[PDB]
Amino acid sequence: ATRFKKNRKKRGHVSAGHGRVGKHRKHPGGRGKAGGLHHMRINFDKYHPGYFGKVGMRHLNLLKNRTYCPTINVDKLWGLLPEEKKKEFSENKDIAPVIDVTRKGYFKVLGNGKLKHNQPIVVKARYFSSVAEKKIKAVGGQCILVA
């Protein structure tokens, strides 16, 4: 990989592509994020707007396991289960699938997307969106709370 490097093609060019006037010096602007708010301020404000300052209150120790909550929208509930069983459930109107999304790894069911019309489906989840539940029972299904 070292023979594909751009410095190789400037082998006999004196300045190595770094300029004859400005030269390549050692940290001519500072080190790291040195000049923020002083002479790199234009860069900071143009590319990282809200960088300086603090907002909000502290959460002293977090324990992300408490609030871990993967989500799934209602438009993927039918795609969760295999194609042949999807065909069977759609064909037979006397029975409906009850899907435990927690086993697949989802805690909350969100309401984005379109469910199939007149296809009942029961969903078991730890949390439900209001619109998700509305669509579930609009297509004739039911939401079941589990823990």
Partner: protein, 186 residues
């Protein structure tokens, strides 16, 4: 001396040759370059041009979008120079004849089960040399995450560009310049 733009040489922009050294893709490019030259077909010219494009400019097309685009022509075939990906949000598929570079396994199985079929571009050239009953389609070329960082810099007024940040919590690029309470907003 002569006063000419660019010293008098016409300058083209974009790809001139295939970069991929994939022998099958090179054969396909050769075949469709010949087809575009020997026929007048803008169809063949466009396919030859698109077979050359980088990966980001032959994006995947989902099955749902494929069927939605093919909804009003049930008898024609859909030609995509990208890949066809399965869409779990789609409940049912219906009899699609689609030529594409590659099909994901799930999309291929779903199309075959629905009763349509998947075609390669060599078969497309064999059966429809001039693209009769063939609808050229392409996926969203500007939907990728890289494009979300492009355009006006994040910090320009009314800029929708995402910034480059390690994480997106309350304490990462959210204080001064992004809300009125700290200096200015945006």
């Amino acid at each position: 001396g002569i006063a000419l733009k660019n010293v008098g040489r016409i300058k083209k922009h974009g790809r001139k040759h295939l970069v991929s050294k994939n022998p099958y893709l090179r054969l396909l490019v050769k075949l469709y370059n010949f087809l575009a030259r020997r026929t007048n077909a803008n169809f063949n010219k466009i396919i030859a041009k698109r077979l050359i494009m980088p990966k980001r400019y032959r994006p995947p097309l989902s099955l749902s979008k494929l069927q939605y685009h093919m909804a009003n022509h049930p008898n024609d075939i859909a030609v995509v120079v990208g890949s066809i990906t399965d869409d779990k949000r789609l409940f049912s598929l219906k009899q699609l004849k689609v030529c594409a570079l590659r099909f994901t396994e799930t999309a291929r199985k779903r199309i075959e089960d629905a009763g349509g079929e998947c075609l390669t571009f060599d078969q497309l050239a064999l059966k429809y040399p001039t693209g009769k009953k063939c609808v050229l389609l392409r996926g969203p070329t500007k939907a990728r995450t890289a494009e979300k960082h492009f355009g006006k810099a994040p910090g320009k007024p009314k800029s929708k560009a995402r910034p480059y940040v390690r994480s997106k919590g309350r304490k990462f690029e959210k204080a001064r310049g992004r809300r009125k309470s700290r200096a200015y907003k945006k």
